[PDB]
């Protein structure tokens, strides 16, 4: 298939001790600007880092001077980490990520719901919920008898389900006058034409 | 830093005693896959992604090895300064709209070290996700729970006693 290549952790020369590594790849305009940053963490403290924007291992603390001044010597280690900007970042973006995450699209499931029981002419609150979508760009606008209502509208923050689907709930403070038609109008990059789901008075 | 997409590739985590490990691959917040270390098997969050791409768990196993190494040398280097514990917090929310007669997710943050245990007031059993990396080098972890009608218990060293979020 296609190739998910991880970076190569360069190596060093009742209690608990924690150590952590990661290779961050910051893409903008696809691959028109890649920034590679590599971080080493002992006990919640980042002590060494290779930041592509520098081009060398710089120490973040006194514990870092040994490993940074060390790894900068042997280029079998440096030039490899330096070029991980293509062997990991660029390669991974242009390769498996295209065949997967940069290709995931799931259209939202949109459902209006009247939280307090309907009592016409009494004030109530409509809840347009929008569930199960990817990526996270989405815009949810409310209409009271075909006119955008921004007043009395409160959306949540974006909600990471963590299984590659988001969630947003949008509240409308409103009041059922009979014959009125509220519509939840949802716009998403997985939608050829915007979604409109209606609730009749 | 400011960007459009952010791959968090090759996350290695180790901690002794007990040599606990984790090797993971994030891309925009969600987890692509981990490597099961005991099964020596790459386990994709999304199975569909598994059919569309591949990762060789040996790279994860080597990297975790290097990390056990570095952890040992560094544990020495500091006169053996131990890890500071961290109070964790949870928030529970449902994945789809919950309609009486139709998944419940628990979201714990400020986890550190990476050892939490996740729980009608009786024992029940779920999917748990590998730990996710924060900017402050603690972690957050998520636990799902699959019929509503008329909680979350967390046990940690930063907790004097445990806590539950009803």
């Amino acid at each position: 298939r296609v190739s998910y290549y991880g970076p190569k952790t360069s190596p060093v020369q009742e209690r608990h001790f924690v150590y952590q590594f990661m290779g961050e790849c910051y893409f903008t305009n696809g691959t028109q600007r890649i920034r590679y940053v590599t971080r080493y963490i002992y006990n919640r403290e980042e002590y060494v880092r290779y930041d592509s924007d520098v081009g060398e291992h710089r120490a973040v603390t006194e514990l870092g001077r040994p490993d940074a001044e060390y790894w900068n010597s042997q280029p079998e280690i440096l030039e490899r980490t330096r070029a991980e900007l293509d062997t990991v970042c660029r390669h991974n973006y242009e390769g498996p990520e295209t065949h997967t995450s940069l290709r995931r699209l799931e259209q939202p499931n949109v459902v209006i719901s009247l939280s307090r029981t309907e009592a016409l002419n009494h004030h109530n609150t409509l809840v347009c919920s929008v569930t199960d979508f990817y990526p996270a760009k989405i815009k949810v606008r409310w209409f009271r008898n075909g006119q955008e209502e921004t007043v009395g509208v409160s959306s949540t923050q974006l909600i990471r389900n963590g299984d590659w689907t988001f969630q947003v709930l949008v509240m409308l403070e409103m009041t059922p006058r009979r014959g009125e038609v509220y519509t939840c109008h949802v716009e998403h990059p997985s939608l050829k034409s915007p979604i409109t789901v209606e609730w009749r008075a | 830093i400011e960007a459009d997409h952010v791959g968090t590739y090759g996350i290695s985590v180790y901690q002794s005693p007990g040599d606990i490990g984790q090797y993971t691959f994030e891309f925009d917040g969600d987890e692509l896959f981990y490597v099961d270390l005991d099964k020596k098997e790459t386990v994709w969050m999304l199975p569909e992604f598994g059919q569309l791409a591949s990762f060789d768990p040996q790279g994860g196993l080597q990297n975790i090895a290097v990390v056990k190494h570095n952890l040992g040398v560094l544990t020495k280097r500091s006169n053996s300064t131990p890890a500071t514990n961290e109070a964790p917090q949870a928030t529970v929310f449902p994945k789809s709209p919950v309609l009486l007669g139709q998944t419940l997710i628990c979201f714990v943050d400020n986890i550190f070290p990476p050892v939490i245990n996740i729980t009608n007031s009786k024992s029940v059993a779920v999917y748990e996700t590998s730990f996710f990396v924060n900017r402050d080098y603690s972690f957050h972890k998520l636990s799902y729970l699959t019929i509503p009608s008329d909680d979350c218990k967390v046990e940690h060293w930063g907790l004097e006693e445990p806590v539950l979020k009803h």
Partner: T-cell receptor
Framework: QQVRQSPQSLTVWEGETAILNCSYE??????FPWYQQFPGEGPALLIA?????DKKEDGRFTIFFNKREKKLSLHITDSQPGDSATYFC?????????????FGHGTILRVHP | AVTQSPRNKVAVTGGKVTLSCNQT?????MYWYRQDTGHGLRLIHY???????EKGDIPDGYKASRPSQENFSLILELATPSQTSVYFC???????????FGAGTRLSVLE
């Protein structure tokens, strides 16, 4: 995946040019070491090339690498009899951070004094 | 360097046989191949560091053990004639680009 070395053994007269061949299937491969083994002994790295370059020349030996057709060729010139060995051709996808090395089956060399 | 041990062994079918390897290179990775004509070098077991072992392409019959950074070891728990061969041991560095082999062990499993 597999790596195939031809011919399974080769015989060359002193001073002639040994030409040892190798072909790998997996295009992910980017490191190509050649290990030489002398009877009674473990094998040891003779000469390696990486896919970026098309030839590493080390005095008497030269690797020729073809990325397109996925083909190698090790040239020994003016071969002395101390070159009569078995030559193995390896490849690894280094990005794979495997550890594992994939070893071709080996050509067996006879240098005719 | 890499000294394997013993370099010649003769043992019966059904009896335990323990090769051994010592590596003075401050290396981290160790490997146990066997060489056969027509099937070349084939990897059986390997190890990233003390305590872990990983299964190579032919782990059937042999169990490995890494109790030291210097010491890998094979174990033919129940020997079989099909196991008779020239066994080899190697080691290398993390992300290292060279395999440092041992000299050899000639093993004869006999009925």
């Amino acid at each position: 995946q597999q790596v195939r070395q031809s011919p399974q053994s080769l015989t060359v007269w002193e001073g002639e040019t040994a030409i040892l061949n190798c072909s790998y299937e997996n295009s992910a491969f980017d490191y190509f070491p050649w290990y030489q083994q002398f009877p009674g002994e473990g094998p040891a790295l003779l000469i390696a090339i990486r896919s970026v370059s098309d030839k590493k020349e080390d005095g008497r030996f030269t690797i020729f690498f073809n990325k397109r057709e996925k083909k190698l060729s090790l040239h020994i010139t003016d071969s002395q009899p101390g070159d009569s060995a078995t030559y193995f051709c390896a490849a690894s996808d280094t990005g794979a951070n495997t550890g594992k090395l994939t070893f071709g089956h080996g050509t067996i060399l006879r240098v005719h004094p | 360097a890499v000294t394997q041990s013993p370099r010649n062994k003769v043992a019966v079918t059904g009896g335990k046989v323990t090769l051994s390897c010592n590596q003075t290179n401050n290396h981290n990775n160790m490997y146990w191949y066997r060489q056969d004509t027509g099937h070349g070098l084939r990897l059986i077991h390997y190890s990233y560091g003390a305590g872990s072992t990983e299964k190579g392409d032919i782990p059937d019959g042999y169990k490995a053990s890494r109790p030291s950074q210097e010491n890998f070891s094979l174990i033919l728990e129940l020997a079989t004639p099909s196991q008779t061969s020239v066994y080899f041991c190697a080691s290398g560095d993390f992300w290292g680009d060279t395999l440092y082999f041992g000299a050899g062990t000639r093993l004869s499993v006999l009925e």
